Write a protein that binds this ligand. Structure first.
Ligand code: HDD
Ligand code: HDD
Ligand SMILES: [Ca+2]
Ligand SMILES: [Ca+2]
Ligand SMILES: [Ca+2]
Ligand SMILES: [Ca+2]
Lengths: 678, 678
C-alpha cells in the first residue's frame, strides 16, 4: 500500500488503551455484582467516548461514494504542451486515488439513484498533489459558483420534512430547472442513461471546465479533460435502477471493489481536447461557459496516459471518507480559467474541509499527505502532527538563512499563473451575454441520441415531472423544454395531461455529434466481470450438472457466475429467496429446472413465482436471456418470451450456447423490446 | 415556546446578509465581464461559507429518522405512585417531541430496512425536560453498555469497503450474534415483523430498562414503560420492504407527515408495568437484565395518559436533526436502576452531543430548550447564547445572596436518588450469574407467534444467513439458534445446506404469552390513512367513472385514494410509470380497464406488464385486492388470482364492493397466501 507506514496491525496481541496500557473492554466496573457503574471506569469511558465521536459531517455534496487506489502512466513526454512533471516522460508512473459518487444523496442513499456522478482523481505527483475533481457528465447545471447553494437546496429534500432522498423528482428541483434555463444541458444528460450508469467503471470522467496547460516557456493552451472508459459505456434502465436501489444500495461500490479484487481493475485513457487561446469564442459559444461542450469533430482528443485502479482501501473511513479533494491542488504546468463556476469552487473546497475535519491540519491525514517533502511556515492549529525544527517561520528572515526559498516561474519549479492572462473593464456582478444560449446544446445532445434513447429520456422526464404537484411549475417546465424541442415538450405533456406550448424555433436545429450516445457506442469492448445468473434446481441432479458445466465454460472467459437454486449446497451460490434480475447482466435457465417456471410455482423457501419473475424481469429490462439444454419452449412460453427474439438463446450444446450468449452480453441491451411514441 | 421566538419569515422582503445588509446573491463580482472573481466579494464568500458548513455529524446510531410535535395528557393524578409533576393531575397537558428512527443505517438509508427502531419522546415538563429514549422492541441485544461499540461495529457496514448499508445480512453481524448469545432475544424480534413495521404509527414504544417511580415520601417501585399504539400493530412483508426501500426510501417519514397533515395524528397510550422492589428476581429472571420482558400475565399494564402527535416541524434540520435526547434528562419522581446497559447510556448521550453540535451549549438550541427558567452557574463555551447577569457564579456565595439555592428531596422540588437504594460487595468487572439464561425468552417469543409468523421469522433468518459467506459463522449461528429451538435450527439449516446440530433441550419449553404477535393482534382498530390504489384507464370513459364512484365512497371513510392511469388528467393522481404495489394497502381494478391486463399489452408510457404486475404484487404480498364493476373473471384470470380467495373481492355493485373491501383493509394481511414448511 502507498499508505503502509500508517497501518496498524491487530492480528495478534492483547487489548490496550490508546496509550498502550493493557485493558479489558467487555464488562463495566461496578460497585458489587448487581451494582451501579463507577465513574472511575476509564476503560468504559475511553471506549464509549471514541464510539460517541466516530462520525464526521458527510460531504455537502457527493456524500455517497467509494474509492480506490491506482497508478497513472504517461504515454509520452508532454513538455510540448505542459510543464507538468507527472506528464514529462513516456512510462512515468504516478500513484492515484479516485473517488466516485452521486451528488444529491446523503451517505447511505442508493448508488443507483438517477443523478450526476462524481469522478474525483488525485495524482500524487513528484511536484505535489494534483486533483482533477470531475463528473461523469461534461457540463454543469449553472454558470456561476454563487448559485451552487440554490441548485443544491432545490434538488436536495424539501427542508420542512427532508423528502425526497436522492432524487430530482419533486417540485422544488423542477421549479429551479424551469426558472434557471442554464440547467437544460445537464438536465438532458441526467435524464439520459448517463444519469443511471451500469457502474463507475462504465462511465467516463470530465473536468467540465476549460483549464489551461502552461509550458515552461510561459505559453498556454486551453484544455478540457476527458477520462474515456476502457470498459465501454453502459447504463441501467430506470425500472431496473429503482429495484436495484432496494435490493442492493451498494451496487456500484460492490462492483468496483469486486472488479479490483478479481484482477479486473478498471482503466481509462486520460485525454484532453486542446485548443488555442484565440479559440475561446471560435466554436459558437464561450469556452468560459461550463454548460457547453466542444464537439470532437471540432477538436479531437489527445490521449495522455493510462489511469488504472487496482487496489482497494484497507479502512474505508480513513481513506475514502477522509479524502479531501480540491481544485486548488494544482501543479506547475496547469492553470485556471475565468469560468465563474470554477473560480468560486477554488474557495469552497479549501473552506469545506474545516467542516469535515474539524481543524486546519486536514492535509496531514495519510490519504491527503503528498509524497514529496513539505517546506513552509504554516504552524500550530488543532491536531498538529508535525514537530517543526525551524524556529524562525517567517519570510523574509536571516535567522534561518532565508529558507524556505520562494518558488516561481524562474526558480524552485514554482507554480506560476499563465503570464499572458489579463483582466480589463469595470468591476461587475454581470453575466457575459456570450453565456445566454441555454437551449442549442441541449438540442444537439437530444439529436445525438438514438430513437430508443430519446424515448428513455422522454420517459425519465415523464416520470419525474408527473410527480411535480404544482400545475404552474409543470407549465413552466414545458415552456423551457419546448425551447429545446417542441417534440419533447409534446411527448412529456401527454403524460401529465397538459398541452405543450406552441413551437418556438429560435434554438431548434438538426445538428448531431459523436461520442455522447450510450446505445450508439456499439458492443462493449470486454465482457470480463459481467454477471451471469444460472437458474437451476436441487430437485434434479441433471440441473446442477448442467449448471456446473455452464459455470466452467463461462468462468473461463472471466464472467462472474452465480448458480441460483432453492437451497444452498456445493456449487450453488445463492437461493431464489435472495436472487433478483438486478443481480445479473444475463440470465440462463438450465432446462432440467423447467418445472420451477410456472408463475404459480410455490415453496416456503422463496416468494411465489420468484424463479420465473427473475427471467421475465431480465427479458423486460433488455438483457440477454436463454435456456440451455435443448428443451426451451416450456420456459420461454411461461415467460411470454419469443424463441426467435434478438438476445434470446436456446441451444443444447453448452459451447454453442455460451458462444452465442457472450455476443449478447457484449451487445448488453436489446433495445427492440422497448415501445416508442407515435 | 423557544421555537416561536426563533421562527424566521422570508415570505416578503429583500435579500440580506446575516448582519442585515441588503445584498444580491446571483452573480459573482469580477474584474471585467469575462474576468476572474474577486476576493473582496463578501456576498459570494458568506453564502458559500454557509453552504460549505451546512452538514453536521449524523447520529452514531439512529441516524435515519423523522420527528413531530405533540401533546401528552395525563389520565389521572398519579401522586400515589410517583412525584412526577407531568403526571400529577387528571387532564394535565405537556408538549412533546418524538423522533422515530432505524438503528444501523446512515442518514439517507431506507426507512424500510429490517432493523430495530427508535422511539424517542421528550416531555417538556413544568419541572424540566424528561426524555424516554426507547425502541419498538422491548429488549436489547447486549447486557452491558461497554459492549455497545462491539454490537454496532458488527452490524454496521464492513469497515474496509463500507458494505452493506442498513443491514444485518453480512458475516460480521451474524459472527457477533453467534458469539454473544445475549443477542438472541432482540434478534428474534428483529427477524419477526417488528423488524419491518408498516409505519411508525403502527408500532409500539418501549423504555426497555427497568426504571423506578419514586414518591415524594421517598418510597420506590420498579416500572417498565410501554407506549401502546392506538392505530394497531402492522408489518410489511420482506419482499415488499425490499422493493419499497428502492421505490420510496422516505416511506415511514412520508406516512407520518401525511397522517399529521390530514388530521390523523397518531396516538399511543403511555403505560407502565409496576412491581415492587422485592420482585427484582421474582419472575424467573433479573429485572436489571435488559434482554428480558415481564409477561403481562404476571404484571398488567396501567394506562397513565395519552400521547398524540399532531404537528409537523417547520424546519427538519433545526428541529428533527438537532433534537438531542438523553436518558440523563430525568425529573423528580423517576429514578434509574443498576441495569448495566442503562448505567452506561447515561454517559454516552451527554458526550455524543459535543460531537454533533461541535460545542457545549447544545441545550440552548430551541428544540432542546426547556419551558421553565434555567438557574445555574454553567458559563461560557462556544456558541454561548445567554447573557448571564449573575456575576458571582459559584456556590457557596454571599455576593449573589446564596443564589441559586440547592434543590433536593426536602426543598426546591429537587431531583433525588431513590433513598432505598444501596450497593454492597467488591468492585468488580463481573457479569451477574442471574443474567446467564440467554435462550428461554427467545423461545417464549417464538412460541407466542402464529404459524405463519414463525415461518416469516424462519424465512428472514434463511434470507440473511444464506448471505453469510463463512461456513464457520453459519455453523456457529445454527449452534446458537438450536439452543432456542431445534425446529428453527433445522428449518434454517435446510436453506443453507448444513445439518442442524442435535437438539439441546436445556432451555426448550412450550410457554406462550400475549401481546407480542402482530398477526395475532386481530384487525386494525381504524383504517383511516390506509392507501387504496384504483387501477383505471383513460381509454374508456366508463373506467374513469367507475374510479370516481369508488373514490367518493372510499374517501368518505378516510382512506387515501390514488387513481392510476396511463397519463394524468382530472381525476387521475398517478401514472402507471410511477405506480407500484408498495404504494398501496389495497388495490382495486375497475372492470372497464381489463384491456391493460392482457399479456400482449404494451405502451411507451409505462413498462411492459406494469398494470398487471401491480395487482399481482399486491395479491402476493397478502393485500386485499379486487375487481369492481362487472362479471369480472378476465382480470382475476390474467393475474391467476382465485375469486374464492380470502381478501379477493369481485362485485358489480360499488357499495357492496366497498363494504367488503373495507373489512379487508382492517384484516390488513391475508396470511393464507404464504407457504409453510411441510
Ligand atoms: C461553489 C461550490 C461548488 C461548485 C460550483 C461545485 N462544487 Fe463540487 N463540491 C463542493 C462545492 C462546489 C464542495 C462543497 O466543496 C464539495 C463537498 C465536499 C468537498 O470536499 O467539496 C464538493 C465536492 C465534489 C466532489 C466529490 C469529491 C469527493 O469524492 O470527495 C465532486 C466529484 C465534485 N464536487 C465535482 C464538481 C464538478 C464536476 C463541478 C462543476 C463543474 C462542481 N463540483 C461544482
Ligand atoms: C453506550 C451507548 C449506548 C447504548 C448501550 C445505547 N445507546 Fe441509544 N444512543 C447512543 C448510545 C447508546 C448514542 C451514541 O449516544 C446516541 C446517538 C445520537 C444520540 O443522541 O445518542 C443514541 C441514540 C439512540 C436513539 C435516537 C434518539 C434520536 O432520535 O435522536 C434511540 C431511540 C436510542 N438510542 C435508544 C436506545 C435504547 C432503547 C437502548 C437500549 C435500551 C440504547 N439506545 C442503548
Ligand atoms: Ca419539493
Ligand atoms: Ca440508456
Ligand atoms: Ca461483514
Ligand atoms: Ca440524592
Amino acid at each position: 500500500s502507498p499508505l503502509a507506514a500508517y497501518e496498524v496491525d491487530d492480528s495478534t496481541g492483547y487489548l490496550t488503551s490508546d496509550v498502550g496500557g493493557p485493558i479489558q473492554d467487555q464488562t463495566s466496573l461496578k460497585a458489587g455484582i448487581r451494582g451501579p457503574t463507577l465513574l472511575e471506569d476509564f476503560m468504559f469511558r475511553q471506549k464509549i467516548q471514541h464510539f460517541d465521536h466516530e462520525r464526521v459531517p458527510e460531504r455537502a455534496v457527493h456524500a455517497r461514494g467509494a474509492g480506490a487506489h491506482g497508478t497513472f502512466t504517461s504515454y509520452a513526454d508532454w513538455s510540448n504542451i505542459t510543464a507538468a512533471s507527472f506528464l514529462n516522460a513516456t512510462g512515468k508512473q504516478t500513484p492515484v486515488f479516485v473517488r466516485f459518487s452521486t451528488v444529491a444523496g446523503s451517505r447511505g442513499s442508493a448508488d443507483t439513484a438517477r443523478d450526476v456522478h462524481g469522478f474525483a482523481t488525485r495524482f500524487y505527483t513528484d511536484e505535489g498533489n494534483f486533483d482533477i475533481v470531475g463528473n461523469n457528465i461534461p457540463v454543469f447545471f449553472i454558470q456561476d459558483a454563487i448559485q451552487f447553494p440554490d441548485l443544491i437546496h432545490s434538488v436536495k429534500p424539501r427542508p420542512d420534512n427532508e423528502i425526497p432522498q436522492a432524487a430530482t423528482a419533486h417540485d422544488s428541483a423542477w421549479d429551479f430547472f424551469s426558472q434557471q434555463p442554464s440547467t437544460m444541458h445537464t438536465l438532458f444528460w441526467a435524464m439520459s442513461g448517463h444519469g443511471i450508469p451500469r457502474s463507475y467503471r462504465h462511465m467516463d470522467g470530465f473536468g467540465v471546465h476549460t483549464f489551461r496547460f502552461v509550458k515552461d516557456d510561459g505559453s498556454s493552451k486551453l484544455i478540457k479533460w476527458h477520462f474515456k472508459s476502457r470498459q465501454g459505456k453502459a447504463s441501467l434502465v430506470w425500472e431496473e435502477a429503482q429495484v436495484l436501489s432496494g435490493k442492493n444500495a451498494d451496487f456500484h461500490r460492490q462492483d468496483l471493489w469486486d472488479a479490483i479484487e478479481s484482477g479486473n481493475g478498471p482503466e481509462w485513457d486520460v485525454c484532453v481536447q486542446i485548443v488555442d487561446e484565440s479559440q475561446a469564442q471560435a466554436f459558437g459559444f464561450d469556452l468560459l461557459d461550463p454548460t457547453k461542450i466542444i464537439p470532437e469533430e471540432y477538436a479531437p482528443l489527445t490521449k495522455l496516459g493510462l489511469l488504472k485502479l487496482d487496489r482497494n482501501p484497507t479502512n474505508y473511513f480513513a481513506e475514502t471518507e477522509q479524502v479531501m479533494f480540491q481544485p486548488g491542488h494544482i501543479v506547475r504546468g496547469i492553470d485556471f480559467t475565468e469560468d465563474p463556476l470554477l473560480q468560486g469552487r477554488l474557495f469552497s473546497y479549501l473552506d469545506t474541509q474545516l467542516n469535515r475535519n474539524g481543524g486546519p491540519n486536514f492535509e496531514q491525514l495519510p490519504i491527503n499527505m503528498p509524497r514529496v517533502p513539505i517546506h513552509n511556515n504554516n504552524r500550530d492549529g488543532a491536531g498538529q502532527m508535525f514537530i517543526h525544527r525551524n524556529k524562525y517561520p517567517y519570510t523574509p528572515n536571516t535567522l534561518n538563512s532565508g529558507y524556505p526559498r520562494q518558488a516561481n516561474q524562474n526558480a524552485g519549479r514554482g507554480f506560476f499563473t499563465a503570464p499572458g492572462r489579463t483582466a480589463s473593464g469595470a468591476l461587475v456582478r454581470e453575466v457575459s451575454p456570450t453565456f445566454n444560449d441555454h437551449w442549442s446544446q441541449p438540442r444537439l445532445f437530444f439529436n445525438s441520441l438514438t430513437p430508443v434513447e430519446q424515448q428513455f429520456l422522454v420517459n425519465a422526464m415523464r416520470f419525474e415531472i408527473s410527480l411535480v404537484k404544482s400545475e404552474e411549475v409543470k407549465k413552466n417546465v414545458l415552456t423551457q423544454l419546448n425551447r429545446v424541442s417542441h417534440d419533447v415538450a409534446v411527448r412529456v405533456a401527454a403524460a401529465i395531461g397538459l398541452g405543450a406550448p406552441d413551437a418556438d424555433d429560435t434554438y431548434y436545429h438538426n445538428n448531431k455529434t459523436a461520442g455522447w450516445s450510450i446505445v450508439g457506442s456499439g458492443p462493449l469492448p470486454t465482457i470480463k466481470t459481467l454477471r451471469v445468473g444460472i437458474l437451476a434446481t436441487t430437485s434434479e441432479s441433471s440441473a446442477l450438472d448442467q449448471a456446473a458445466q455452464l459455470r466452467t465454460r463461462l468462468e473461463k472467459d472471466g464472467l462472474v457466475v452465480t448458480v441460483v437454486a432453492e437451497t444452498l449446497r456445493e456449487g450453488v451460490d445463492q437461493t431464489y429467496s435472495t436472487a433478483d434480475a438486478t443481480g445479473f447482466d444475463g440470465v440462463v435457465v438450465v432446462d432440467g429446472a423447467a418445472a420451477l417456471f410456472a408463475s404459480t410455482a410455490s415453496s416456503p423457501l422463496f416468494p411465489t413465482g420468484r424463479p420465473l419473475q427473475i427471467f421475465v424481469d431480465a427479458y423486460r429490462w433488455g438483457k440477454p436471456v436463454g435456456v440451455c439444454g435443448g428443451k426451451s419452449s416450456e420456459v420461454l412460453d411461461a415467460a411470454d418470451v419469443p424463441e426467435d427474439g434478438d438476445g434470446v438463446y436456446s441451444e443444447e450444446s453448452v459451447d454453442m450456447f455460451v458462444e452465442e450468449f457472450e455476443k449478447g452480453l457484449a451487445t448488453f441491451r436489446f433495445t427492440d423490446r422497448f415501445a416508442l411514441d407515435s
